[PDB]
Structures are given as C-alpha cells and as structure tokens.
Design a protein around this ligand. Sequence first.
Ligand code: S4M
Ligand code: S4M
Ligand code: 8OF
Ligand code: 8OF
Lengths: 279, 273
Amino acid sequence: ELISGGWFREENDQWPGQAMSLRVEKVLYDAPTKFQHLTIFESDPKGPWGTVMALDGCIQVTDYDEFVYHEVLGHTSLCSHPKPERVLIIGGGDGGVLREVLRHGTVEHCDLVDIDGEVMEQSKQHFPQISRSLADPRATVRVGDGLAFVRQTPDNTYDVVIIDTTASKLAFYKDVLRILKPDGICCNQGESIWLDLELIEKMSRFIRETGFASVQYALMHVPTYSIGTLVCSKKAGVDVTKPLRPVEDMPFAKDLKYYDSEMHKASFALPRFARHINN
Amino acid sequence: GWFREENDQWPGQAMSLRVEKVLYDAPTKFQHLTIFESDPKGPWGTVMALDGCIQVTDYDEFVYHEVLGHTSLCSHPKPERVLIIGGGDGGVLREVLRHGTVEHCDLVDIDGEVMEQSKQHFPQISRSLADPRATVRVGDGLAFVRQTPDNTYDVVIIDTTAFYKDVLRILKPDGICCNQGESIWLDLELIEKMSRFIRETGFASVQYALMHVPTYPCGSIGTLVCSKKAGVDVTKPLRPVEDMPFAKDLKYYDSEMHKASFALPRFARHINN
Ligand SMILES: C[S@@H](CCCN)C[C@H]1O[C@@H](n2cnc3c(N)ncnc32)[C@H](O)[C@@H]1O
Ligand SMILES: C[S@@H](CCCN)C[C@H]1O[C@@H](n2cnc3c(N)ncnc32)[C@H](O)[C@@H]1O
Ligand SMILES: COc1ccc(Nc2ccnc3ccccc23)cc1
Ligand SMILES: COc1ccc(Nc2ccnc3ccccc23)cc1
C-alpha cells in the first residue's frame, strides 16, 4: 500500500495522539509475510536514515542507527561472560546482533532462530552490511519459533542467550534458564522506561523469580524512539554492570561505533524515577 | 487538529501531536508562541512550542530542567549567585532554587510573553518566577551580560532556543557555565565547533552531558558544562546532591546519572576526550 513520495506513518497504542513520519523515497518491499507485515523502503536521501525496515507498522532497523542496539545487545552480554563459546540468538533475522557476536574470538558457534524466513531474505537483499553475518560458517541460521526451539534444546547448551525480538510469549524464561550453562547470561530487547515502566518492573521480577540470580536493566541512546535491555545472570554474585571482559582488550574495540566499557557502565544508571528497577 | 514538527537538519521526517485544545497561538515581539493541551489519552499534557519547535511539555520537563539545574550547581563548590539566560518558563529556576547555598538568581528572558503564558498555563513550572530569591528581567541576554560587571556570578545557565567572552568575564574564578547543548545525532559538528569556540574564548574546560528524553525528533539533547577555573572535573559531582535535603524530590537527576551523562557513544567521544 505504501508508495514512493508518500510518507510512512508510525503510531503507538501506548502513546495515542502521537505519530512519527518518514518520507518514502522508494518502496523496496511491502507485503504480508507468513507471520507479519514486512515493509522495507529507502527513506529521504536528504535525511540520515537510509534504508528502513518496519514489522507490523513499527520500525525495527535503519541503516543509520542499527549499530546502537546491535552493539549494545551483542557486547553488553558477551562482555559479561567469562568465556562465551556457544551463543543463541532468538529473532535477530536481520543479522545485526550476529555480526556483533561473531566479532568475539571466543565464540565457536552461534545458533540463530528467527520465525520469519522472509525477514532474513529481505535483509540479505536490502541490508547487506547487517546480514552478511548470516552466511558465516560459525553461524547456523534456522527458520522457526524460538519458543519451540528452546523447549527442544537440552539443558546447559548455551553460554549466552540473546532475545532480539519485536513475539509475545517471549514458561519460556524457565526454558532459557534451563538451556543456559551455570555461568550463563541472558539478555533481551527490554522495552521503554517511559512507555512501559510497570512491564519492566514486572518482567525483572518474574525473571528473578524464575530463578535467575540477578537482572539489571540497561538504557541506550537511539536517535529516535526509550529502548533498553534486561541483562540476566544465571550465576549468583555476578555484577553485569561492570564489564567482566572489557572490550578494550579485544582486537575489534576500535571498530565499534557506540559501545565501550564507559558506555556499558553508564547504561545501567537509570533516571531516578526508574532507578528502583536496578537498585 | 495535529501539531506537526519538522527540522531542516532532518528532512523527510516529522513528529506530530494531536491538539486537544489551543491555549495560545500568536506571534510575539520575538517569536511564534504556541501553547496547546495535547491528547488526554497520551502522556504529554500541556505543550509549548516556540517558532514551531516544542520546548516544554508537562510530562518530560523535569528531565532537561533537573539536568541543567543540578549538573551545573553540583559542579560548583558553593554556588551563591546564579544567572539564567532564557528559561522564561521557570523550570531551571525552580531547580536552581532547591539549592540552599543560592542567595540570589537573576533570570533574563527576551520574551515577556513566554513568562506570562507560563504563569497561566504551566503553574507547576512557573511558580518559581515569584520567589524572593529570584529577580526576573525581560530583555536580551546578550545586552544583559554586556552590562554586567566582572566576577558577578558563580553559575551562568543558558537555557535558550563575544557573548561567551562576556559570560566568562561575568563569572567568578570558580565559575561554571552551562548551556542547552544540541544533538550528537548529525548535529555533532556544531557541538564540536561550540566546544572549541568556548575553550578558545578562555574557559578552561568544556564537557558534554547527554540526557534521556522520552522523545526528541531533532536527535538527542545535551548540555555543555564549562568551567572557568582550570583543573575542575565537571564529570564527577563536586557537591553530591545526595547530601542535600531535596535529593529525593528529583525525578531524573542523581550522582549516578550525573557521572553517566558524560559517557558518550564511541563516535561522539572526541567531544569530551
Ligand atoms: C527484526 S528483529 C528487531 C530489530 C532489531 N534487530 C525482530 C525479529 O524477531 C523475530 N521474531 C518474532 N517472534 C519470534 C519468535 N517467536 N521466534 C523467533 N523470532 C521471532 C521477528 O521475525 C523479527 O525478525
Ligand atoms: C523556553 S526556554 C527553552 C527551554 C525549555 N526551558 C527558551 C527561552 O530562551 C529565550 N531566549 C531566546 N533568545 C534569547 C536571548 N537572546 N536572550 C534571552 N532569552 C532568550 C526565549 O524567549 C525562550 O523563552
Ligand atoms: C530494537 O532496536 C531498535 C532500537 C531503536 C529503534 N528505533 C526506531 C523505532 C521506530 N521508529 C524509528 C524511526 C526512525 C529511527 C528509529 C526508529 C528500533 C529498533
Ligand atoms: C530543552 O530541552 C528539551 C528537551 C526535550 C524537548 N522535547 C520534545 C521536543 C520536540 N518535540 C517533542 C515532541 C513530543 C514530545 C517531546 C518533544 C524539548 C526541549
């Protein structure tokens, strides 16, 4: 339904009476998928955004800002683990998180499971700088439901599980805890302290009560939206807020556009109204 | 009935709010002033825009107000006399006046209509304007500082929409200056140029602090925190807010947030070194 020269409009049920719009230079994809509406377009070349992906009317990836959420999810988790060798990504069909995971020399294998094979296909076509990772021999990329995937995973399979999703069931957290090895780290796309503070409070407590030893929420600075990540440790006495394996000691630190150890530490400082999430 | 905000810096992008009720909409002697009640099912409440750019909403005003007010004052060893340039809504002043060390604050905003419309439509922001420790003037900040004697202020806060040499001059030796600092998203070249312009006018140091706002279509909002005295580290609170009686009244700012605010994404880090 979208056309070139028209505007893409984004609205939110949580924030009614607000809309965010982008001019569409060129439609690249606009169709229902087996699971969701997929919209890819080139935004205004006078603007900074580049190619833009939306799922069910909500922007999920742009060329300009993708490095933020990808670096944060990939490095805050892996740098909190003593030796991450086996990694699971749930969602992340675009490849961004996987690219960041694969920078780490300790990773021998990463499994990626995204329900929507068309997201992965369209990302190969229209976001090669994000999706190149999906071809890596250190990765196995599967089309399937992450819920069923973790249910059929044996105990103690993964060092890190990263949940990079949009959907709504993501019982599941008990499976995640079970498939993690004893030093395990889980991290998730965490929702907004502005939109959904009560949800973060709720999720944080239900994750701890599932049996995770600790859960800390990290905030990120994106150019437009808040977005956070819940970083969960299976093992008691882990402080995920200070990098266990600082990125600065690894050869790729200087390739990163957002993340470093100072950013990692700062991300866990929350505005005072939300600070009770982390204590 | 939707208010739409666009930027020349960000072409092909727009942010819109539904207008529930127009409260004020007229040219002023200096700028277009628009005040509206936004959607009561949304979180924003009353919204003020100047020349088509939103400057204040009931919902988020605490962020920029607390950050400008406290990052500066907690970076000063004993802030007694404070100047605010702009800030006609009263938000920064309200924050500055929480500090017990403050004996007097002058506030100078070019547009008297902004203070009048804030008195009417943002009483929880503009209450401060009536405080006996405050003197409010309607006038240009540039001319005001030009006619201010040397070593008058402990802190100058620039809360707006040669001057800097006058700001440096009117500051006492431990003086702190802070300004509404613009977005590291695209707008980065300007912050870099501002920070160099400020150091070269003779401030000893300039550090940029980032804030987390619920929406900013212009990218991000920050503050440049500048110290007249050499060897001051404005990135670590000199007088922690936690030692003061009003710390728990704050909705955003604390010492953790103060320290964190100066940690910049890698691409922008060269702003602060
Ligand atoms: C695009 S990614 C979000 C953008 C940040 N890279 C969101 C992905 O999660 C997938 N997703 C949603 N639900 C699931 C389940 N249940 N399992 C796996 N992947 C899922 C969905 O297909 C998106 O590609
Ligand atoms: C509303 S405040 C915006 C930030 C939200 N506290 C911006 C104020 O700066 C004033 N302003 C703009 N230029 C000047 C000058 N030159 N002098 C004083 N005040 C000024 C303008 O009238 C706004 O009220
Ligand atoms: C999950 O990682 C993220 C993090 C941030 C975004 N940001 C944006 C959301 C919606 N519309 C936009 C429009 C333009 C730019 C960014 C956005 C999306 C996914
Ligand atoms: C001086 O500091 C600030 C900081 C933040 C804003 N916020 C908003 C700016 C622009 N459009 C919006 C649209 C909707 C909501 C908020 C905003 C203004 C001034």
